[PDB]
Symmetry: D2
Subunit: 392 residues, 4 copies
Amino acid sequence: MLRWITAGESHGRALVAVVEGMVAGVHVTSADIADQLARRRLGYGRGARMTFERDAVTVLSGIRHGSTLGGPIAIEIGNTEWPKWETVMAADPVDPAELADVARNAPLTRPRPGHADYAGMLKYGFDDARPVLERASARETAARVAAGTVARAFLRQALGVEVLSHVISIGASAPYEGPPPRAEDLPAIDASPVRAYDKAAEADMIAQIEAAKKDGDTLGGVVEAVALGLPVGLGSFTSGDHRLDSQLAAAVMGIQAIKGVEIGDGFQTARRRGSRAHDEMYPGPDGVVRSTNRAGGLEGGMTNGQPLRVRAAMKPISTVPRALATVDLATGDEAVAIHQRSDVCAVPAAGVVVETMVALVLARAALEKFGGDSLAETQRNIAAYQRSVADR
Amino acid sequence: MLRWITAGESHGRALVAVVEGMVAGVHVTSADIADQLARRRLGYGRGARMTFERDAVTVLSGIRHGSTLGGPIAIEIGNTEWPKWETVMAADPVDPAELADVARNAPLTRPRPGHADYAGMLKYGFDDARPVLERASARETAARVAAGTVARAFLRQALGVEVLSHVISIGASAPYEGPPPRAEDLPAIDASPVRAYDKAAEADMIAQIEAAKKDGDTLGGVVEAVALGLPVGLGSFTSGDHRLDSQLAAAVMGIQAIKGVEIGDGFQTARRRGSRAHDEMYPGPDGVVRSTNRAGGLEGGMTNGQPLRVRAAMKPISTVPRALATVDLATGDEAVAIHQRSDVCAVPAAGVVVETMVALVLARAALEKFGGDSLAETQRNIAAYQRSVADR
Amino acid sequence: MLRWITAGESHGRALVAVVEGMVAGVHVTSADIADQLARRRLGYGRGARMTFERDAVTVLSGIRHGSTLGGPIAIEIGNTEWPKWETVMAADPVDPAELADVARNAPLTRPRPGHADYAGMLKYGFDDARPVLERASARETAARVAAGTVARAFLRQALGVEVLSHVISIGASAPYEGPPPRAEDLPAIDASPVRAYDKAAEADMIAQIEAAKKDGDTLGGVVEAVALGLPVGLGSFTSGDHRLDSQLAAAVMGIQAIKGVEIGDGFQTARRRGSRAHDEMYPGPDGVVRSTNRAGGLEGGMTNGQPLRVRAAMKPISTVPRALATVDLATGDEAVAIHQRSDVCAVPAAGVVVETMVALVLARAALEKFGGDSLAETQRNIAAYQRSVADR
Amino acid sequence: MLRWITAGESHGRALVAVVEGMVAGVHVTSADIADQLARRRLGYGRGARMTFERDAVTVLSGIRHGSTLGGPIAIEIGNTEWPKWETVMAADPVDPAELADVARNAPLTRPRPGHADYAGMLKYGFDDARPVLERASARETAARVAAGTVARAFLRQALGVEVLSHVISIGASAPYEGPPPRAEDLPAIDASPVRAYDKAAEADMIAQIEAAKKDGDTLGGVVEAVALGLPVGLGSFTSGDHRLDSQLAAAVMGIQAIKGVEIGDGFQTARRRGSRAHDEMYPGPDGVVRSTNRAGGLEGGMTNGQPLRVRAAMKPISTVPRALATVDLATGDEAVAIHQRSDVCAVPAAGVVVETMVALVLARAALEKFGGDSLAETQRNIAAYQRSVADR
Ligand SMILES: NC(=O)c1cccnc1
Ligand SMILES: NC(=O)c1cccnc1
Ligand SMILES: NC(=O)c1cccnc1
Ligand SMILES: NC(=O)c1cccnc1
Ligand SMILES: [Cl-]
Ligand SMILES: [Cl-]
Ligand SMILES: [Cl-]
Ligand SMILES: [Cl-]
Ligand code: NA
Ligand code: NA
Ligand code: NA
Ligand code: NA
Ligand code: NA
Ligand code: NA
Ligand code: NA
Ligand code: NA
């Protein structure tokens, strides 16, 4: 089975992604990985969060001469700020007397509302929030995106599938409810300050961000990931855990700051009558065709061949300076929460991470159905299935 | 690790639930299971879907004298309609000539929009939808509820945790946005025709159902499961898959007809400014207290001690008679989809299933943190943790 | 992924096996299951352990008209002795005053050396061994064999693979070290009182059993499972857990009373020089051929196309009357262990269980490589792989 | 759950180990890791396999100031020979014309008997053995040992458990069948050229190696890992996969070149009568005591408190120069296998790897029973269990 794991602290020496169970023969390079990582730098005000200097990407294992080997793929992402943190986040012991004179090593005892700090401190018995926030930080999503690049390459090469995203709403903007983009629209989306597909929505969202920035506040939003070209029959109806919507929901809701996930029209579908809620089927040249995609490409836990549409609701992830009451756990005193990040809105970049998690799940589901140990083998199995479906 | 699996076809001989990894010493009985199963009969018009005769519950393994043994727990739920289906759904071969004279055995070749039928037929290479719909059917949720009863008993006995649900909206009703219920409110909720906690919302929802029923249409809705009494620190921030919101989203989205999941204020949180989106913390007698629960009891992937609130969006699950165009896959001809169920709205009963899936995930997470092989052992570990938290 | 789980107590109402992840379209019937279950009745003196009355087999789910459906397959095996145990092993509470008058309900507080009793009592905090021995009992292997029948059917139909076993040694017999049997030899083996393939070894083993029976003692032995017809490349070298020898060792060592597992010549291979330890390769008509199979069909974690040979060492599983000192945990007093079973040797029947566990692992590994959701799909993928190998 | 994964090719840039699910608060350092890695350099003739220059160890994540953080722990092990391989094993594409002039890049088309080469080439559709041998190589066991160090630290700190190993036999030596060593014996064992605990066996084994070295041959052997101080009740009898012997067998048999695994007296137990096969129990001051440990510390799938003894049979792992016939898969011609390693015997070093795999499994099983997210929490749970057992 395709599996992925991330490791690293935000201010540690490096991040690591390991992907296990990918077939041999998939073409992917360090440049491909760096290109996807660069897409996390996108978005109005993103420079408040990310440093200009790009981190070094190193493929440590599992790829030779631009082709996967079949074994575990380990990718390392450096931390350009490591020299500042090499004592505070040293792996090995440091003289506590030396540490006592390092202002940067001071414990953090005032948990931020909305973050892992409080519950994590209690759970792990930490008197300092540092070990919690270092691992909880959305910097970890860089490692996800490295892993996701492998999944993306597989999906394109094996199935001709493309994954992209666009932003539906930020703050109080009027949601974009038109058709999703296609792959050819990605350049324009990624050139939008808010990674919008619609110009009216783009202007509205930019205005929301400007107003929040002026007020010293922060915003969340809704993003839609779109996967095009999928075959019918990934996922299964045979049990709850095998339903592709279950798997996608796990992967997307597990992203930092995500508080909701929908497939297609989601919560709006729940407000519709059955006569207008579903996608009717009609005869077409090369099989059954639909005129609507309210289902968002999944029915009964499986891909139906329509575009897959997965929406994620992101809470505002940056703590508002001076606004939020908390408690100093060291003393029990009232306190004010201090922020770790200063960006107003991370929704556009969060979209890129949603794409990644969707790609990983889709690649896993494809390998479950089509099997194979090399790309050519998987491709033969796919072709045979496609022929058997066509011959119906 | 706590694990659960369901088996059975809707019209097969019986359903089976197996729960593996529950500690010994949890008090649970066949009567407890039957009581939870009875809660699936709740809801206005539910008798259109469920037969009056109650199915037989049999505990086959893993419980002795009302106490779990520590091994796998297998629960069987009979099918009162089996005599009608004992040939059509016979496990063993039947003379195809005999089968040819059984009208009930006719293949189903007109997939219903919104259901597993089409994709499942293609995926598994079936020329008949029967094997797909028999396993995809929400009758399988009975087996889930049997398993969930074990989880519920554990949560109550080990942690003093209660799980309940109430309905937020059905069709175009105005959503109930007030506080959630407590455990003591469950009798009144379960006595409501729409399992509502609010009388205004109840009337509105009943009206929606009446109008849909008159129009020969069907409805979905939104339900909120609520878990009370949880300790701080179930789930973790250490990776996406360990976040309790990820796990809950998987379990809830994997329920038939669910198209969206939210934690707390979910999608509305994405429309709020950071200054009003989160739950501020204040000093209190026995620790930190909050005045709001916008987070729905989870922050950074972990329980924070507030009520857990998980909302599920359900599409309308019953196919509207004569409304939906489809294709006869045998001929390629246009067709009209024929319904398998006739109930207008299954939202209230679906709430009971959401409760079950939440309970299973919570029990698994509790056993992950607190360990133990017997209830008394787990309880000692819980008490020690609670003391260590209190002593802060 | 193919998964299997067993549930049941020895004296409970029934056993249940559930197999999840088997493809649709595999031909298997209740008669096939009963036939494999009957093979557990084989062996000299087996009637000391098994009652003459055959247990009822019922397929509850996942098979229709003799063909798998693709969903979970649940098989129930009745307990003919249930009426004797229906109070002592009742699932629901019984008046403790009534129980106090039932001699059969007396707690067991004298753990048997060599069994789960002592450690299980301590682990789970039981003051009675009953709940431990009821689940630990090798009666549970009946449920394994039911599950294994599904795996066997798949292996035969998809790959033309056969799994069998023969006994190498019992007690102090001289081990049979000749070639393994082929499928056509199974009738003769199953007709042997000790399921031997060699007549000299058969006589020696029968003599050992006769001597032990006269002395009131018990015996273990060594069995070899053999799987024929496997394709090259099941399992992988990419990590320890993916090595097929790792997976087979887990499955076989997890059988009750097994204390050792070898692949091919195992421990003897460790005593040989490299010049005589391995299987040299030579040109042949339809590919590479070997003249020896010291490796037992696995090299570097993968099938090499030779017969797979897996040997299991079984300790003597029946407690010797009056021989073994133990402690009464209720009092701390010295005691003598009392036996639960009276058979001298269960090695022949244990062989049948080893076959089953090998079949389950092989079926899982085949589905991992070849994928597919229906048998025809898996078969096409297999054929394509076989062609690609042949074309080398 | 505790999980471990390794990544890396033998001649790649680096190896990586990731351990997920270890509690926070375990004291472990890069020096501890390097010390365990150094123990792989032990053994007569080991310098034929390992280069004098020690590889760099870098802890990338999951440990701060010598204490685990609770998140994933990633450890990197450098490759001192990388400059020689940086083109041949480059991750990114290299001009095939440039590669054509690099003798080191020549494909390997003559699979070695006894290795992954042949089956791996066929499985993955490789025309070159290089990608197979690079990942299959026992160099990967360095990454295992890095991960195992974390497990070892946890076992010592949480449970007072020590894991060690000694060599039982090499080639045709007379096996050492005396008592196992204790922790205090490790210095002497690690100072033995063959890591023997017995002086007679040591001399015999050294003689075997000398004779094989003179004859240009290679040897395997048998090693015993010993774990001391374990609590009663790790593992379970509730299913085959939960039996600790199953889990240990998987972990040990998954080590390169291992062809057999035994618990305690293993295969010899299968040749004994029940009256002499098991460990009788007697009253003692602080509980039940045994006078023998034929069981090797496990009964019914669980630790019984005696020393755990796990034996592994290793085939000879280095290919004998000029001895083994194979086939050139490029041409179909007969060929002779060429060796990748030149050491006569790797049994002593293999023992260190067996220790590591045992430690990982034991740590996982301990965390399953005792739970906890920090060491102090786990320790409290352990103490409470120990008290509850003592109070019996
Ligand atoms: N990159 C980010 O800052 C981010 C924040 C939240 C979710 N995903 C990504
Ligand atoms: N019981 C039901 O009919 C049902 C339908 C959809 C989801 N959950 C339960
Ligand atoms: N059927 C049996 O009695 C048995 C005993 C031990 C192992 N496998 C089967
Ligand atoms: N280090 C080694 O060479 C080795 C070989 C085989 C098994 N384990 C380790
Ligand atoms: Cl912040
Ligand atoms: Cl319907
Ligand atoms: Cl016995
Ligand atoms: Cl070699
Ligand atoms: Na390929
Ligand atoms: Na669409
Ligand atoms: Na208890
Ligand atoms: Na609330
Ligand atoms: Na088929
Ligand atoms: Na053979
Ligand atoms: Na600690
Ligand atoms: Na010992």
